[PDB]
RNA sequence: AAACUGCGAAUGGCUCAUUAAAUCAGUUAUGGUUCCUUUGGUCGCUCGUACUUGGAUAACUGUGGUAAUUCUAGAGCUAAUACAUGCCGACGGGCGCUGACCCCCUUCGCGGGGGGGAUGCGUGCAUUUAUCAGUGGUGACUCUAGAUAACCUCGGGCCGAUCGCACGCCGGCGGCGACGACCCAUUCGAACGUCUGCCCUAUCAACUUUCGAUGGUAGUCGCCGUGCCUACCAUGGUGACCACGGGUGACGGGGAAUCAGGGUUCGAUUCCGGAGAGGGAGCCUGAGAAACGGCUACCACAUCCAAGGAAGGCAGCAGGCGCGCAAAUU
């Protein structure tokens, strides 16, 4: 259970960190 | 007192239980559980007093020990178990499912739901923290500890929980324009859309909510439960649909009914 | 030393003063980094606390106390005992048989930090509630405003 | 018995109160553990909520940190010197928190000599031992001796610390409450705090 | 060996009491001559000391070693042990069994 | 049946003696504490006989003592989710320091740079001390999470030698529960503090501070914040806006009677909070008691006795005596 739940948040953490960097990189120039 | 108390007097019981004066001296003291003593409906007052499946408190025990009642998917044989807001009660013998939802008068309603709707519930978010080895942890209004949630979920939000697995399937954030119900205070049982939230640091916030008919009221931020996104609720609603009628309107609506009869 | 007038060495617990860095650091200057916090309810930290050298643990900005509870205001009455002052609060109490009022007062002891210098006994002080600091002290000075005879 | 109530005192105005209830159990106090110097003796005390405390009655060793070097080791406490609270606690040799005590230095002298590859604490009498010289002058490879040589640039200690290493005992402050957790841990004195504490020891004599 | 006794007033002897008289002691759980009724209860009781004197009504005796003659009422009729061991390891120890 | 083990007996019931910013009521805070149980999380995260470990002791049998008690002694057995001890396995490793030896690039070379590495020492969560950098959150942390050097109490810290029901799949694997577990959160609270509020009295005007009174520094003790206590310092703190002292046929509120409007008087009494168990005091057990249908003393009463001793606590339900103008069924 631990290694299946830890490996699914790591995939869902990557998406939420990636979508939160476009919001910053786009805003700096604009 | 030298320790904790184990009794409850009938006049000291929560008024929305609707207990009469002359049945006894005592009232069921709720067991310790996920919901507070003054904000819960024990199983005995629901099986005996509301549904009238039992006539005495001894008959409630006979129904319970046959393992017929499931509270959110688990069999509870305690007859003073503190069920509360948004819980799902399932009686498989008669094929009935109920959800504990306040009505406009501030009392828990007998709200029957479909077997499909009984597979999930909506839970407010009370606490978020980080535990050992950096694992995020939630704590809800149902005393549910759910780890590894989405990082977009914050305090005062609402999540949807699948009762079979206990995992989050979706969530709604707290923002203006979202539907909500009041779960305490003087507007208890009312449904409306959030319009404003005034912040008082070091004290309690205040949220303004407007009904569908145009009536506006305000509550403390701790008494707000986000139901749906926008105007559309995520759960089925009771008969009154959250609109509080005035006493004159209620009188006219009652008098019009008996004229229809004939 | 002025800073070291007590029997026990006075320091800010958060601050470590013995970082052996280089001989040049010894040659350059000996000024300790200072711990100051932002006691925040819209209040601002005085610059005499960020640039001072006093050691007192019951100060809000540079000590181990938390400000929560009630925010009150009063007039300084006495400055006699070490590092704490006595202020006066005046109010009107309503007697409803006569539909009238009467003047009443309360004397309240508060802690005064060294960051609030040049304060005389005539002026308005804002106080914030904290944990019990002594037998009869529960409040702490958060802002000082000069009296009517302001220079 | 010993109570820690607030209603046996006087009011702020100076008026005598009258108690309305008797002594309760959430108000009790216990006799002090005057932790002395000796082989370890610890007694467990059952406390509110069912938990436990450790009354240390004798202590001999403790965990102490050389903060500048970041070197924490077990060390045998030797003697009790100036106390900031009471100067009576030094004649009876009582260990409490924030007390000035003497500790051995050899665990620190070994780490310094094994890390910087320099002799510290050696007297000027040419004391050489084959084990010590194998610690000090053992031949390393090119890269290891390079990494040791680039390290000797900042391997310097103050003049007050190195004098203490001549007599084999350092001055330390116990930062733990030995009568509540049963152990005496702390830090070695340095810098201006050591300068301050070396004055008031001499001012008592 | 002197294994116990009672004095003339029915009071029993205690091993640790180095006295020939009767002393009052505060007894608790795990003490001889006492049996608490509540958890944590202690009671002060009269108990005689272990030194034998002439103020005793009965004296208990246990024969450590067998001599030559046989008492007509002792050693003659041997009572079989009413119960055997329950624990399997104890059964093995008694009957010199093995792992198989 | 009995007995060992676990849990409860700290709730309920009674009464109103004490108590005058005390209790209590509305309002706040714990970022200053503890918490049996319920609910949820966690429970191969640690690199170091197990196909079952050890000794007893009840019930029972037998011999007894005392005038007397829910008094107990000796002897012969026998169990554990009582009391103790103690592994295997996931276990192959991973990650930090130490690091003899080996390889590559460059310079003519010394040299410089980049790698591989045998051999050893540590490692998880709770405990204690010190240092470092800046996942998530607050109005604000000396918060949570992280890193490093160590520590880790024998009166000792967690890491399951426990029990039931259905029986099976390919000698191995197993499905439902029950009982226990350090910790985190939750529920029931409790405990300390914040602001305002109480009757009569000056024929009570100054009070507190030697014997802590107000504050500072460091510590002891305490579940913790604090003169709670100690040592060393300073001389403070309250008062006609009534302090200090005295009285009260004074438990405090929700409330009751009267009533044009204002007002006056009552509230021992079934709901909420407090206090007590003849008067003081001190404790054991336990998550919780300074418990009294628990224990230990002293003071006042009082019970049985073979005179050696033993046993007491109706302001619980009935009931009796006494007191009274004044109050019901063993």
Q: Residue by residue, what is the 3-state secondary structure of D78-144?
A: EEEEEECCCCCCCCCCCECCCEEEEEECHHHHHHHHHHCCCCCCCCCCCCCCHHHHHHHCCCCCHHH
In this complex, which of A5, A6, A16 lies closest to B150 when CB atoms are compared? A16
Strands E22-27 vs E43-48: parallel, antiparallel or unpaired: antiparallel
Residue partners of B133: CB distance under 8 A and separation at least 6: none
Question: Rounded to a whole number, what is the distance in angstroms from the first to the last CA of chain B?
Answer: 60
> Within 7-66 of chain D, which residues have Cβ less than 7 Å from strand F?
8-18, 20-33, 40, 42-56, 63-65
Residue B165 DSSP one-character state? T
Residues D15-38 as b or e (16 or more Cβ within 10 Å = b)? eeeeeeeeeeeeeeeeeebebebe
Cα(E2)–Cα(D205) distance, integer angstroms:
66
> Do E and D have ≥3 inter-chain CB pairs under 8 A?
no
A9, closest residue in chain B (CA to CA): B148
Cα(B222)–Cα(B124) distance, integer angstroms:
10
3-state SS, B242-260, equals CCCCCHHHHHHHHHHHHHH
Please compute Rg for chain D using Cα positions: 24
Tell me the chain C residues in contact with residue B202 when contact means C-beta distances shorter than 8 Å: 41, 68, 71
Strands C124-129 vs C137-145: parallel, antiparallel or unpaired: antiparallel
Q: Return the sign of the alpha-carbon dihedral for residues E9, E15, E20, E22.
A: negative
Q: CA–C1' span, B138 to F43, in Å? A: 20
Diameter of chain C measured on Cα atoms: 80
Diameter of chain E measured on Cα atoms: 59
**CA distances for C87 relative to C111, C144, D164, D192, E96, angstroms:** 10, 12, 52, 39, 90
Cα(D23)–Cα(D1) distance, integer angstroms:
8
In this complex, which of A5, A8, A16 lies closest to B151 when CB atoms are compared? A16
D157, closest residue in chain C (CA to CA): C20
Cβ atoms B76, B54 nearer than 8 A? no
List of chains touching B (3+ CB pairs within 8 A): A, C
User: Reduced to 3 DSSP states, what percent helix, strand and coil does chain D have, rounded to the nearest 5?
Assistant: 25, 30, 45
Tell me the chain D residues in contact with residue C24 when contact means C-beta distances shorter than 8 Å: none
Residue whose C-alpha is closest to residue B197's, from B215, B211, B183, B178: B178
Cβ atoms D68, D108 nearer than 8 A? no
Q: Which helix (H) or strand (E) holds E27?
A: strand E22-27
Cα(D17)–Cα(D7) distance, integer angstroms:
7
Cβ atoms C74, C124 nearer than 8 A? yes
C17/D191 CB distance under 8 A: yes
C19/D98 CB distance under 8 A: no
**CA distances for B82 relative to A30, B42, B142, D151, angstroms:** 54, 5, 11, 67
Structural determination approach: cryo-EM
Tell me the chain B residues in contact with residue C41 when contact means C-beta distances shorter than 8 Å: 201-202
Q: CA–C1' span, D19 to F19, in Å? A: 8
Cα(E60)–Cα(D147) distance, integer angstroms:
84
**DSSP bridge pairs for B129:** B137
Q: What are phi and psi of D36, to 5 degrees?
A: -100, -175
Tell me the chain D residues in contact with residue C7 when contact means C-beta distances shorter than 8 Å: 84-85, 200
**CA distances for C11 relative to B43, C4, C35, D84, D199, angstroms:** 60, 9, 10, 14, 17
The CB density around residue E67, as the number of other CB atoms within 10 Å, is 7
Question: Does D86 contact chain C (CB < 8 Å)?
Answer: no
Burial class (CB in 10 A: 0-12, 13-18, 19+), C38: exposed
Cβ atoms C10, C4 nearer than 8 A? yes
User: Reduced to 3 DSSP states, what percent helix, strand and coil does chain C have, rounded to the nearest 5?
Assistant: 5, 30, 60
Q: How many domains does chain C have?
A: 1
Tell me the chain B residues in contact with residue A12 when contact means C-beta distances shorter than 8 Å: 150
Cα(C17)–Cα(D5) distance, integer angstroms:
40
3-state secondary structure (DSSP) of residue D165: helix
Cα(B19)–Cα(B22) distance, integer angstroms:
9
Cα(B41)–Cα(B82) distance, integer angstroms:
6
Interaxial angle between packed helices D159-167 and D191-202, expressed in degrees from 0 to 180 and rounded to the nearest 10:
60
**CA distances for B101 relative to B44, B86, B225, angstroms:** 17, 6, 12
Q: CA–C1' span, E46 to F306, in Å? A: 20
Q: Judged by CB atoms within 8 Å, which residues 6-25 of D form the interface with C?
A: 9, 12
Residues B20-58 as b or e (16 or more Cβ within 10 Å = b)? eeeeeeebbbbeebbbeeebbbbbbbbbbbbeebbeeee
Q: Is the CB of D130 under 7 A from strand F?
A: no
Nearest 5°: CA angle at B139, between B135 and B142? 145
**Domain range spanning residue C49?**
1-151
Q: What are phi and psi of E19, to 5 degrees?
A: -150, 155
Q: How many CA atoms lie within 13 A of D20 on its CB side?
A: 0
C7/D154 CB distance under 8 A: no
Q: Is the CB of E77 under 7 A from strand F?
A: no
Contacts 24+ apart (CB under 8 A), C6-14: C7/D84, C7/D85, C7/D200, C8/D84, C8/D98, C9/D192, C9/D193, C9/D196, C9/D197, C10/C55, C11/C55, C11/D193, C12/C55, C12/C62, C13/C64
3-state secondary structure (DSSP) of residue E3: strand
Alpha-helix runs per DSSP H in C1-113: 23-28, 47-50
**CA distances for D29 relative to A16, D2, D4, D8, D205, angstroms:** 55, 5, 6, 14, 37
**CA distances for E21 relative to C32, E8, E43, E53, angstroms:** 76, 12, 19, 9
Q: What are phi and psi of B45, to 5 degrees?
A: -70, -10
The alpha carbon of A11 is separated from its chain's Cα centroid by a whole number of angstroms, namely 8
C18/D191 CB distance under 8 A: yes
Question: Does B147 contact chain A (CB < 8 Å)?
Answer: yes
Burial class (CB in 10 A: 0-12, 13-18, 19+), B102: buried
The CB density around residue C70, as the number of other CB atoms within 10 Å, is 10
Token pair recorded at residue B155: 């305090």
Q: Is the CB of D87 under 7 A from strand F?
A: yes
Q: CA–C1' span, C11 to F12, in Å? A: 57
Cα(B232)–Cα(B230) distance, integer angstroms:
6
3-state secondary structure (DSSP) of residue C62: coil
Cα(E19)–Cα(E50) distance, integer angstroms:
6
A12, closest residue in chain B (CA to CA): B150
Residue whose C-alpha is closest to residue B217's, from B253, B252, B190, B184: B190
Strands (E), B92-203: 96-102, 108-112, 120-131, 135-140, 145-147, 158-162, 167-172, 179-182, 191-198
Nucleotides of chain F within 7 Å of a protein C-beta?
8-12, 18-23, 28-32, 34-43, 45, 52-55, 59-61, 64-68, 70-80, 98-101, 111-113, 115, 125-132, 135-142, 144-146, 148-157, 184-197, 207-208, 212-232, 234-245, 262-264, 271-276, 280-292, 294-297, 308-310
**DSSP bridge pairs for B196:** B208
> Do B and A have ≥3 inter-chain CB pairs under 8 A?
yes
Token pair recorded at residue B100: 């504990």
Question: Rounded to a whole number, what is the distance in angstroms from the first to the last CA of chain D?
Answer: 41
Q: CA–C1' span, D153 to F112, in Å? A: 20
Q: Which helix (H) or strand (E) holds C139?
A: strand C137-145
> Within 55-74 of chain D, which residues have Cβ less than 7 Å from strand F?
55-56, 63-65, 67, 70-74
B201, closest residue in chain C (CA to CA): C41
Q: Is the CB of E90 under 7 A from strand F?
A: yes
Token pair recorded at residue D135: 């610690």
Token pair recorded at residue D189: 């004195």
Token pair recorded at residue C40: 């925040």
Residue whose C-alpha is closest to residue B182's, from B155, B210, B203: B210
């Amino acid at each position: 259970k631990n290694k299946e739940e830890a490996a699914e948040y790591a995939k869902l953490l990557a998406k939420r960190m990636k979508e939160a960097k476009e919001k910053r990189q786009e805003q700096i120039a604009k | 007192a030298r320790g904790p108390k184990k009794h409850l007097k009938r006049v000291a019981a929560p008024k929305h239980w609707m207990l009469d004066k002359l049945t006894g001296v005592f009232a069921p003291r709720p067991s310790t559980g996920p919901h507070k003593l003054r904000e819960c409906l024990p199983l005995i007052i629901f099986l005996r007093n509301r549904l009238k499946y039992a006539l005495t408190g001894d008959e409630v025990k006979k129904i319970c020990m046959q393992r017929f009642i499931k509270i959110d998917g688990k069999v509870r044989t305690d007859i003073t178990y503190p069920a509360g807001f948004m819980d799902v009660i399932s009686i498989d013998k008669t094929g009935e499912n109920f959800r504990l939802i306040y009505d406009t008068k501030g009392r828990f309603a007998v709200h029957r739901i479909t077997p499909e709707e009984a597979k999930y519930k909506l839970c407010k978010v009370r606490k978020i923290f980080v535990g050992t080895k950096g694992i995020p942890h939630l704590v809800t209004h149902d005393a549910r500890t759910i780890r590894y949630p989405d990082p977009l979920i914050k305090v005062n939000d609402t999540i949807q929980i699948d009762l079979e697995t206990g995992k989050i399937t979706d969530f709604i954030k707290f923002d203006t324009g979202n539907l909500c119900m009041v779960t305490g205070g003087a507007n208890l049982g009312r449904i409306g859309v959030i319009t404003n939230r005034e912040r008082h640091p070091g004290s309690f916030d205040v949220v303004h909510v407007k009904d569908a008919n145009g009536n506006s009221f305000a509550t403390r931020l701790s008494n707000i439960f986000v139901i749906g996104k926008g105007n559309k609720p995520w759960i089925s609603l009771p008969r009154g649909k959250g609109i509080r009628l005035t006493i004159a309107e209620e009188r006219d609506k009652r008098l019009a009914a008996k004229q229809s009869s004939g | 030393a002025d800073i070291q007038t007590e029997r026990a060495y006075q320091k800010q617990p958060t601050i470590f003063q013995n970082k052996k860095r280089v001989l040049l650091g010894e040659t350059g200057k000996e000024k300790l980094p200072r711990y100051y916090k932002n006691i925040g309810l819209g209040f601002k930290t005085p610059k005499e606390a960020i640039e001072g050298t006093y050691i007192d643990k019951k100060c809000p900005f540079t000590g181990n106390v938390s400000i929560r509870g009630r925010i009150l205001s009063g007039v300084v009455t006495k400055m006699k005992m070490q590092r704490t002052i006595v202020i006066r609060r005046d109010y009107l109490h309503y007697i409803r048989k006569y539909n009238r009022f009467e003047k009443r007062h309360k004397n309240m002891s508060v802690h005064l930090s060294p960051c609030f210098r040049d304060v005389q006994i005539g002026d308005i002080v804002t106080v914030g509630e904290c944990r019990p600091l002594s037998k009869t002290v529960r409040f702490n000075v958060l802002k000082v405003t000069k009296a009517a005879g302001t220079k | 018995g010993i109570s820690r109530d607030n209603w046996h005192k006087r009011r702020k105005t100076g008026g005598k109160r009258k108690p309305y209830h008797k002594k309760r159990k959430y108000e009790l106090g216990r006799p002090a553990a005057n932790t002395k110097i000796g082989p370890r003796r610890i007694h467990t005390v059952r406390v509110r909520g069912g938990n436990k405390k450790y009354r240390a009655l004798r202590l001999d060793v403790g965990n102490f940190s050389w903060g500048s070097e970041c070197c924490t080791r077990k060390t045998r406490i030797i003697d009790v010197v100036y106390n900031a609270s009471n100067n009576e606690l030094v004649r009876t040799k009582t260990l409490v928190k924030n007390c000035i005590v003497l500790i051995d230095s050899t665990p620190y002298r070994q780490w310094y000599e094994s890390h910087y590859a320099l002799p510290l604490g050696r007297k000027k009498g040419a004391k050489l031992t084959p084990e010590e010289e194998e610690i000090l002058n053992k031949k390393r490879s090119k890269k290891i001796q390079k990494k040791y040589d680039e390290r000797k640039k900042n391997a310097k200690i103050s003049s007050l610390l190195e004098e203490q290493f001549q007599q084999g005992k350092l001055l330390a402050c116990i930062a733990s409450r030995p009568g509540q957790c049963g152990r005496a841990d702390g830090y070695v004195l340095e810098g201006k705090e050591l300068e301050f504490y070396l004055r008031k020891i001499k001012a008592r004599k | 060996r002197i294994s116990g006794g009672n004095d003339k007033q029915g009071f029993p002897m205690k091993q640790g009491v180095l006295t020939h008289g009767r002393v009052r002691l505060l007894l608790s759980k795990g003490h001889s001559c006492y049996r608490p009724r509540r958890t944590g209860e202690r009671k002060r009781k009269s108990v005689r000391g272990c030194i034998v004197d002439a103020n005793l009504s009965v004296l208990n005796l246990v024969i450590v070693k067998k001599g030559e003659k046989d008492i007509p009422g002792l050693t003659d009729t041997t009572v079989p042990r009413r119960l055997g061991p329950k624990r399997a390891s104890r059964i093995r120890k008694l009957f010199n069994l093995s792992k198989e």
